[PDB]
Amino acid sequence: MKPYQRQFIEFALNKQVLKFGEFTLKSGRKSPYFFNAGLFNTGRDLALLGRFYAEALVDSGIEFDLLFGPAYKGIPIATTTAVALAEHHDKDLPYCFNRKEGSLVGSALQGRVMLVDDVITAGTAIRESMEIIQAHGATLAGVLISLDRQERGRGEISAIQEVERDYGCKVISIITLKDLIAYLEEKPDMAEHLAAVRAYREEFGV
Amino acid sequence: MKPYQRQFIEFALNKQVLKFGEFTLKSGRKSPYFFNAGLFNTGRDLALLGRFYAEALVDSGIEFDLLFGPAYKGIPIATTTAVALAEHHDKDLPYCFNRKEAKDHGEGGSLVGSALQGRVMLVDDVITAGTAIRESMEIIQAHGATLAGVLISLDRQERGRGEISAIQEVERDYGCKVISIITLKDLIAYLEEKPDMAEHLAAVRAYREEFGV
Numbered sequence A: 001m002k003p004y005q006r007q008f009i010e011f012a013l014n015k016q017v018l019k020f021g022e023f024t025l026k027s028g029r030k031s032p033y034f035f036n037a038g039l040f041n042t043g044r045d046l047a048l049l050g051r052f053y054a055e056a057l058v059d060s061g062i063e064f065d066l067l068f069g070p071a072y073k074g075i076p077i078a079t080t081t082a083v084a085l086a087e088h089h090d091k092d093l094p095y096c097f098n099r100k101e102g103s104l105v106g107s108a109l110q111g112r113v114m115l116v117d118d119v120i121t122a123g124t125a126i127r128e129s130m131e132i133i134q135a136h137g138a139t140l141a142g143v144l145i146s147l148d149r150q151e152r153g154r155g156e157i158s159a160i161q162e163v164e165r166d167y168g169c170k171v172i173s174i175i176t177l178k179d180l181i182a183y184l185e186e187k188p189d190m191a192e193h194l195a196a197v198r199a200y201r202e203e204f205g206v
Numbered sequence B: 001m002k003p004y005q006r007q008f009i010e011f012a013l014n015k016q017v018l019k020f021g022e023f024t025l026k027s028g029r030k031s032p033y034f035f036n037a038g039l040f041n042t043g044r045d046l047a048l049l050g051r052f053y054a055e056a057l058v059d060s061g062i063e064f065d066l067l068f069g070p071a072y073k074g075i076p077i078a079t080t081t082a083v084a085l086a087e088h089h090d091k092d093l094p095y096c097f098n099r100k101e102a103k104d105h106g107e108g109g110s111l112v113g114s115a116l117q118g119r120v121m122l123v124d125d126v127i128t129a130g131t132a133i134r135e136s137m138e139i140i141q142a143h144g145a146t147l148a149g150v151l152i153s154l155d156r157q158e159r160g161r162g163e164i165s166a167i168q169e170v171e172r173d174y175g176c177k178v179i180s181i182i183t184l185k186d187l188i189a190y191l192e193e194k195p196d197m198a199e200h201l202a203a204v205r206a207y208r209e210e211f212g213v
């Protein structure tokens, strides 16, 4: 784990973004933990979050012509990421997002799209976004999320490998479940939660 | 006017958000100028727009405890505005936005971000009919909070369906204060300084005379 990843983890934890309980994921999976990016709830949180995303984007070297954020979590995420790119990297990118109701807000959806979202579990959201992206004649160059939960997709291979294989894109993340776990191994009163996570990973992990 | 207002006008003009000609408004009137805030659609546009909104909020001095951006157009505005306040004014504010429908899994609920509480600053681009606010007010009330103000980009300052303006209708029907980056009068004052904008200035003056205030 690099220093910036440790910083991101501590940032997320200081904001109670990582929750433990009986959750039912978008994919229907019953998870013992949930990463809620909606909890980066103040302007300072949003600002820093965008800085993390922009840094990852520029460091990746992936070429893209537009930033797309799927509703709803992707909306504030794409907005602050777009702002960070312009303010700190001198990169002025057209941005776009959809209505969850398709109907789009922002620039025209064209070119090589960089989709930014909070997490990737089974790859459902990415698949839903692609319906919209392909409907506008655009392509998918990459996907960047805060947390790669490192779970399988619709089959046996990881959700990431499936997405990369299906759309010929590159998926990158700020941190992975592994990084999060390594960090938590250092903290007290986490044993039970970590055990629960492992039990879960034995079933959907890859 | 303040420098940020002058700067906002040039910015809007630059990105073609503000344009002159003949446009049929929702009311059916023929306006000699139109403001399409939806044209601010790149990262830099978003960055600057948030800086201007923040300037306008700080200028007003109105106190608030939450920045609320109604779905969907208000989400990016509230987001970039929240970022500008924290980055350029050292004012860290909670933000929040609504979902059009409840989430059937995960964290559930119909709100994203902060809890809807306290003196809310509603963030938007423009107010035409002056009724889209009622919907957001409903949500704000459903959570027991109060509407402290409404932040918009441009106040067209033209009467609604009867005598008063859409903005004045909002302030009287909700008891809040509407903060605007600029107004029709600021536009007139701007064109006044630019000699080439002579013919447009005249058309905008005529329109304000007939529909203004």
Ligand SMILES: O=P(O)(O)OC[C@H]1O[C@H](OP(=O)(O)OP(=O)(O)O)[C@H](O)[C@@H]1O
Pocket (backbone or CB within 6 Å): A025, A026, A027, A070, A071, A072, A073, A074, A117, A118, A119, A120, A121, A122, A123, A124, A125, A126, A159, B103, B106
């Ligand atoms: O890789 P996946 O299996 O698709 O899981 C992750 C996705 O699920 C959540 O969206 P969701 O629509 O559930 O929440 P939102 O409406 O708050 O964005 C999350 O924001 C990701 O987009």
Ligand SMILES: O=C(O)c1cc(=O)[nH]c(=O)[nH]1
Pocket (backbone or CB within 6 Å): A024, A025, A026, A027, A033, A034, A035, A036, A037, A118, A119, A120, A121, A122, B106
């Ligand atoms: O898979 C999901 O629905 C999911 C998992 C998670 O950790 N966070 C989130 O917002 N969604």
Ligand SMILES: O=C(O)c1cc(=O)[nH]c(=O)[nH]1
Pocket (backbone or CB within 6 Å): B024, B025, B026, B027, B033, B034, B035, B036, B037, B126, B128, B156
């Ligand atoms: O009143 C309107 O229809 C209207 C005027 C304007 O300048 N901008 C906008 O979006 N609507």
Ligand SMILES: [Mg+2]
Pocket (backbone or CB within 6 Å): A070, A071, A072, A073, A074, A125
């Ligand atoms: Mg989502």
